[PDB]
């Protein structure tokens, strides 16, 4: 579901992802997602506009916009958070990546 | 380079991709891309709005918008075509996938 955050069932580079696909775009068996990285050991120079900072589990995470990819529903684990309150920053980051605006 | 089409140097599910990242968004060592699939053996019901039809090498291809992903520059092979003349349909497909508009 768009803007919900899930854990991966299989080992991946990151441990959470946010679903960014529209809820009226049907791709059977898959969803387009963006991984979230723990902010703790990342560069302080990472653009906040392209890589928004969000809060889950009492810590900070960066949305790894440029590591967007689709996953099969078989890898979609437990839902751990909802980022719909950060739609503006998420939309801005995605649009920046393609359109530089 | 945005809207240029390249072959993969390593075996992938598809054999061409289009670079869709902005040319002023720098991700060192990587680019965001969308694979192209040969249209020949695909369903005739596949949405043209979400999966545009383009022409390369004297055949038709579908832009596999929902299989968008980043690749390392090490996998970027020869440039085989430029799809900048299809920017309107490419932009429409990408925006549809996230925003349903
Ligand atoms: Cl991490
Ligand atoms: Cl947040
Ligand atoms: Cl193919
Ligand atoms: Cl074309």
Residue numbers in the entry:
A (entry chain A), B (entry chain A): 1 to 101
Sentences from the paper on this structure:
The structures of S12G, V46L and S60E consist of a single chain in the asymmetric unit, with two chloride ions. In the present study, we selected three such suppressor substitutions, Y8D, V46L and S60E with ΔTm˃3°C. The suppressors Y8D, V46L and the suppressor S60E were ~3 kcal/mol and ~4 kcal/mol respectively more stable than the WT. The WT could refold back till 2 M GdnCl, whereas the suppressors Y8D, V46L and suppressor S60E could refold even at 3 and 4 M GdnCl respectively. L46 is involved in a hydrogen-bond interaction with R62 and hydrophobic interactions with M64. The hydrogen-bond interactions are formed between the main chain oxygen atom of L46 and side chain nitrogen atoms of R62 (NH1, NH2). The average B-factors of the V46L structure are lower than the WT with the most reductions in the loops 8–14 and 39–46. V46L also similarly affects the rigidity of the 8–14 and 39–46 loops important for CcdA binding and GyrA14 rejuvenation. The CcdB positions 10, 12 and 46 are involved in CcdA binding and mutations at these positions as well as the nearby E11 residue will affect CcdA interaction and conformation of the CcdA interacting loop from residues 8 to 15 (8YKRESRYR15).
